[PDB]
Design a protein around this nucleic acid. Structure first.
Lengths: 48, 142, 110, 56, 150
RNA sequence: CCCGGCGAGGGGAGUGAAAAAGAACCUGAAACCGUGUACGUACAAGCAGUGGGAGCACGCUUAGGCGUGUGACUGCGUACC
RNA sequence: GUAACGGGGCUAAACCAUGCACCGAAGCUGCGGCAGCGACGCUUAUGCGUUGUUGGGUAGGGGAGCGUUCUGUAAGCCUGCGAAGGUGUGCUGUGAGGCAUGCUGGAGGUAUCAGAAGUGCGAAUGCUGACAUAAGUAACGAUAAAGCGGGUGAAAAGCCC
């Protein structure tokens, strides 16, 4: 039990998406937004 | 091991003499091209000239089937606007008979620096006499 | 033993000086001086002074002899460029580069 | 009027292959003064063909 | 970013990329697309979760023999030399001392000792228990910790 | 001290652990521009590489037919977003 | 510009029928290796004995990782017997990478396990700086005009007389 021997429970610290960071990541070049359209724009999307 | 590759500095080339009298132009050219490239040698290498020197005699007496003697046309462009010039098989034979065999073989040889080198090993003569006796060419019944 | 003389920040483009430098590369100092004397180029005046300085350095700092010295190595390197403004037509401004060069001459008794 | 592609350093050197200067083949020597000079030109001391042309 | 809102150059006509502000994040000397702000990084810890962690930590310390229990721990005078000598006698170098009532004399003596810390029973924290190699608690200190943790 | 125009700029000497720390001064990358050396290149056509591959140079190390550089010739091959 | 077999050429090297060979792909098989998903030995705190089968991929979804800066671990560890950075070489992993070491450099660097992000650039007629290209090319700003002697000077078509 030391400050450099404690670990979190498995599956409790998922990393998190990082868009637009290369081909390998699978979320580059529009980062999951698809292509042209209202939904692809910054701040785009229709109201409730 | 690695597959054998012929060395241009140690490749053996022989000299042959072929009589073209009465031979079909195309069927004679294929054998000449085959031997000039060296395809008949077990040491054949695509990037090396392993062929043999061949002397062709009586080029003016080469034969062509059908009406090709008067119907076959050799086209060439001089690079000027008119440019396009033509000559029939009979006209070529009368003017420069050696070009008939030379043109036929050249087309059948590979295109590029190597193919040009292979063509240099072909010696075509219109007459029945050649001045290459020093090379001791061997009669080739092709 | 080889002696070095340098003229740094010379007011001439390296390309212009390199033309003269190629003339005397590998030549004997006596022959090189004659070539530079009768070359009608501004770089010739600059290169000759550097070559003469190298000859003087060999004597004083190395005790060499003219008869055996020759231009073993010589090269010109681009120096810092001075930026200037050249007014052009219709109010446009153009950038002028006043290029300089570093002239290096090496003389050895080899 | 202007290039569509940037010419290479190789092309630049190829064009400059004819820019090399030519050095004087040799310098004449005055018969009497003995100093070197351009052929058919007077010497720096005012001599030419050993005649001592005006040197003031 | 300090500067004017004027458009650096007209939208069309020049051969330059369109610009609208000298403070654009794309530009040098102005930007930071998502500039940070002061923020509070504190997290909530459930009372039971915090107490449960302390109980687990204390259980590990006794399991690893890192918890020392003594009837009492004090120094005659507020002198670091006396405290250092006492720790040497008990063979302790990096120690956290917990007492029922934090004596002024002991507190002063341990202030200059880098590897020695003195706390009251109510001043214990999870990090300190794990960080220090040894934990020394008096008999009274054990009592208060027991009631606090329950 | 020496070359130079009582220049600029250098070469010595000296200081310093270091002057390739010399004030255009810590470290000193890339584009870009040069000198030297090895090899290739003036009858050969194209995204300039890739697969095959001779020759040359060099290094081996207990001939060991290996490594490195170059790349005649040859199959295939029309950049990226 | 042959320009209506890709070409050479072909009277079969064309066409029809029949037959037997061979060439021919990243298809199939062989040999070695990696990974995903299934069932079987309740084996096993599970790797396999094995065992089948799968593995082109845009938008997009899911899973697992590398490295960078910073905080704890760290008043620890490495370091003037040479840190970071720079530049080579060798080795190494499926990859992002890692390890060692020569030279340069001359003072900082940081394991492990966790934590937090201004965390990764070739493109946006992106922004700043530097440096190329065209090129030693255009041009040297009114076609009112210069020539010579002497002087000074390291050097005079341009300065002085």
């Amino acid at each position: 039990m030391r400050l450099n021997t404690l670990s979190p429970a498995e599956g409790s610290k998922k990393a998190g998406k990082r868009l637009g960071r290369g081909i390998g990541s699978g979320l580059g070049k529009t980062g999951g937004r698809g292509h042209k359209g209202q939904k692809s724009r910054s701040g785009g999307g229709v109201r409730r | 091991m690695k597959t054998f590759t012929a060395k241009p500095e140690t490749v053996k080339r022989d000299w042959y003499v072929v009589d073209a009298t009465g031979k079909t132009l195309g069927r004679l050219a294929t054998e000449l091209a085959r031997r000039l490239r060296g395809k008949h040698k077990a040491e054949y290498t695509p990037h090396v000239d392993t062929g043999d020197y061949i002397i062709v005699l009586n080029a003016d007496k080469v034969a062509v089937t059908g009406n090709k003697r008067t119907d076959k046309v050799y086209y060439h462009h001089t690079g000027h606007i008119g440019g396009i010039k033509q000559a029939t098989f009979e006209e070529m034979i009368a003017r420069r008979p050696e070009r008939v065999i030379e043109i036929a073989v050249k087309g059948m040889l590979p295109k590029g620096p190597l193919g040009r080198a292979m063509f240099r090993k072909l010696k075509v003569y219109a007459g029945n006499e050649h001045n290459h006796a020093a090379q001791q060419p061997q009669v080739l019944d092709i | 033993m080889e002696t070095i003389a340098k003229h740094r920040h010379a007011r001439s483009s390296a390309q212009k000086v390199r033309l003269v430098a190629d003339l005397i590369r590998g030549k004997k100092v006596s022959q090189a001086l004659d070539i530079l004397t009768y070359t009608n180029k501004k770089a010739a005046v600059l290169v000759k002074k550097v070559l003469e300085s190298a000859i003087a350095n060999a004597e004083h700092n190395d005790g060499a002899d003219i008869d055996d010295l020759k231009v073993t190595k010589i090269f010109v390197d681009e120096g810092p460029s001075m930026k200037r403004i050249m007014p052009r037509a219709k109010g446009r401004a153009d950038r002028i580069l006043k290029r300089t060069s570093h002239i290096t001459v090496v003389v050895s008794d080899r | 009027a202007v290039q569509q592609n940037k010419p290479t350093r190789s092309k630049r050197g190829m064009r400059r292959s004819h820019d090399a200067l030519t050095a004087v083949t040799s310098l004449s020597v005055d018969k009497t003064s003995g100093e070197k000079h351009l052929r058919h030109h007077i010497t720096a001391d005012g001599y030419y063909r050993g005649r001592k042309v005006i040197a003031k | 970013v300090t500067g004017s809102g004027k458009k650096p150059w007209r939208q069309k006509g020049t051969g330059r990329a369109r610009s609208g502000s000298i403070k654009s994040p794309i530009w040098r000397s102005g930007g930071v697309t998502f500039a940070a702000r002061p923020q509070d990084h504190s997290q909530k810890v459930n009372k039971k979760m915090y107490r449960g962690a302390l109980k687990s930590i204390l259980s590990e310390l006794v399991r690893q023999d890192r918890l020392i229990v003594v009837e009492k721990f004090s120094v005659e005078a507020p002198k670091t030399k006396l405290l250092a000598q006492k720790l040497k006698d008990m063979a302790l170098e990096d120690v956290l001392i917990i007492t029922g009532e934090l004596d002024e004399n002991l507190f002063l003596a341990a202030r200059n000792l880098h590897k020695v810390d003195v706390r009251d029973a109510t001043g214990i924290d999870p990090v300190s228990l794990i960080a220090f190699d040894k934990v020394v608690m008096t008999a009274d200190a054990v009592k208060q910790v027991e009631e606090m943790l329950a």
